Curated annotation (Swiss-Prot), chain A:
Complex and partners: The mushroom-shaped unit cells of the Sulfolobales' S-layers may consist of three SlaB subunits and six SlaA subunits.
Stretches assigned to coiled coil: none
Residues of the full protein shown: 1273 to 1424 of 1424
Protein name: S-layer protein A
Organism: Sulfolobus acidocaldarius (strain ATCC 33909 / DSM 639 / JCM 8929 / NBRC 15157 / NCIMB 11770)
UniProt-annotated glycosylation sites, renumbered to this chain: 4, 32, 147
PTM description: Glycosylated. C-terminal glycosylation sites are modified with a heterogeneous family of glycans, with the largest having a composition Glc(1)Man(2)GlcNAc(2) plus 6-sulfoquinovose (QuiS).
Family note: Belongs to the Sulfolobales SlaA family.
Function description: S-layer large protein. May form the highly ordered outer sheath.
Location within or outside the cell: Secreted, Cell wall, S-layer
């Protein structure tokens, strides 16, 4: 209703999900900048924002992809069977209203590739309900980093 | 139908049975300007069918993907993971 | 001739690093514990042996010639040796590392007439020494090059002395493939990818 | 207490007949080894994240491995370079788990 409801969005750590830049379509959003990683392992350092108490938890889906395999005319990587993963996002498991976390710094995980190549990478991300959850978004959920570099 | 991860899976759904000359369909509720790079992993761990399909500017799509039985690497038994 | 001696317990060991943490922010400290293979008894070799060798016990005094601080490996000690007249401090390397004039630790003495029990109270910081431990590229594929966990370091009057690796003492530590891992280290992570090989570093 | 950096819940998969399900220890080789780099949230700003995690422990073959009585040993081990864990448990073992694929 709006006791719990909760829009939830994805945006970079270069520019917060506290407030994202107006280069984001609602139907897409290729970030025209970069993830700047820490190269320990390739780690999509970002923010996510959840506003209201969120009683369930949810996902920040993630997939590593070659940039040689990219379609830049619709913002969709075209191939690369490599590795996929996703993050848990907990706020709290709140029993109604009174338990919220406004800013959640999410350093998205991908790791466990170690027998398949690395190169110059593109990676799609998305604020993702748990399996058709509660209603998120005043946008963007969808975050396609045009500049990533993979390290295994 | 099951709404896997927010995109409404209408097809494929987990557990689908196919015969000689029968069709894999792709219909999923995406967010617009989406491609699906679709990988038919055979039981020998190989993508005998990689193909890139385009969703429409609305959220939907009804696409025919791969014709199983009518192509080599589908003419004899066994389990795939699309 | 050696005659009757009453001896029972002895000192008390502390299991937190107190009165100056070496935490990256000084305000904050996590729950240090010196490792508790402490075989027990701060060894109580009497000053007044000749008294021991005659009269049974009364209020009895000690060269505080040891305070046991055993861990995973070796031991360290902070011991007021009443036959030098100064605070002898030893470490796990083996050596006297400081020697502090007069009384600047209090004397262990008996608390009663007929007893064998003594006190103990100790205050530490950490000053690190480090030593690389190599971890394979057959796991995560990010070869970790990991410096030794911190190093315990006693303090008396605000002055610090190395008591040696805190990965043979301070618990909890952890091990990944037998690599001592815990506060005030660094791992040089040699990140070997299909791009080549970079080398980042992560401080602990 | 705060942990901001990367550790991992190391997932080692087993059967219930590859696990002595009373003593909490394996009696065989992993039937899958995979890792989940858990960039755990700081306690330094409870407001900026919460230090009580839910982790969706990730594995690359246990949605690709078949239905059956599985046992998984989930180990808190630092991806080295990261702070200490575990004033104990250091692990969680599910000893009556059931995969369904």
């Amino acid at each position: 209703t709006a006791e719990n409801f909760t829009p939830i969005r994805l945006a970079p750590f270069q520019v917060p999900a506290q407030v994202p830049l107006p280069n984001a379509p609602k139907l897409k959003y290729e970030y025209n900048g970069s993830i700047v990683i820490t190269p320990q392992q390739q780690v999509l350092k970002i923010y996510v924002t959840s506003i209201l108490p969120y009683p369930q938890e949810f996902q920040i889906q993630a997939f590593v992809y070659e940039a040689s395999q990219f379609n830049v005319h619709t913002g969709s990587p075209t191939a690369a069977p490599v590795y996929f993963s996703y993050s848990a996002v907990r706020a709290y498991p709140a029993l109604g209203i009174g338990t919220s976390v406004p800013n959640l710094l999410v350093y998205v995980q991908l790791q466990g590739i170690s027998n398949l190549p690395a190169g110059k990478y593109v990676i799609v991300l998305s604020a993702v309900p748990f399996a058709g959850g509660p209603v998120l978004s005043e946008y963007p959920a969808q975050l396609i980093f045009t500049n990533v570099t993979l390290t295994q | 139908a099951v709404t896997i991860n927010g995109i409404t899976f209408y097809s494929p759904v987990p557990n689908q049975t196919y015969k000689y000359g029968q069709q894999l369909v792709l219909s999923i509720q995406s967010q617009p300007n989406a491609l699906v790079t679709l990988y038919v992993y055979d039981p020998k761990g190989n993508v005998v069918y990689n193909n890139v399909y385009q969703t429409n500017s609305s959220g939907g799509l009804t696409a025919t993907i791969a014709t199983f039985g009518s192509t080599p690497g589908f003419t004899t038994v066994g389990t795939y993971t699309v | 001739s050696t005659l009757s001696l009453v001896a029972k317990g002895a000192g008390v060991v502390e299991f937190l690093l107190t009165a100056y943490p070496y935490t990256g922010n000084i305000t904050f400290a996590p729950p240090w514990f010196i490792a508790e293979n402490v075989v027990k008894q701060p060894f109580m070799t009497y000053s007044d042996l000749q008294f021991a060798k005659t009269n049974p016990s009364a209020i009895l005094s000690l060269s505080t010639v040891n305070i046991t601080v055993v861990g995973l490996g070796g031991k360290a000690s902070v011991y007021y040796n009443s036959t030098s007249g100064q605070t002898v401090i030893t470490n796990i390397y083996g050596q006297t590392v400081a020697t502090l004039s007069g009384n600047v630790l209090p004397t262990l003495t008996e608390l009663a007439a007929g007893n064998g029990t003594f006190t103990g109270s100790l205050q530490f910081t950490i000053v690190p020494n480090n030593t690389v431990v190599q971890i394979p590229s057959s796991l995560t594929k990010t070869s970790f090059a990991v410096y030794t966990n911190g190093s315990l370091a006693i303090v008396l009057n605000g002055k610090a002395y190395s008591l040696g690796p805190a990965g043979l003492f301070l618990l909890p530590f952890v091990t990944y493939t037998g690599s001592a891992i815990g506060a005030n280290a660094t791992a040089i992570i040699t990140v070997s990818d299909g791009v080549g090989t970079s080398t980042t570093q992560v401080p602990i």
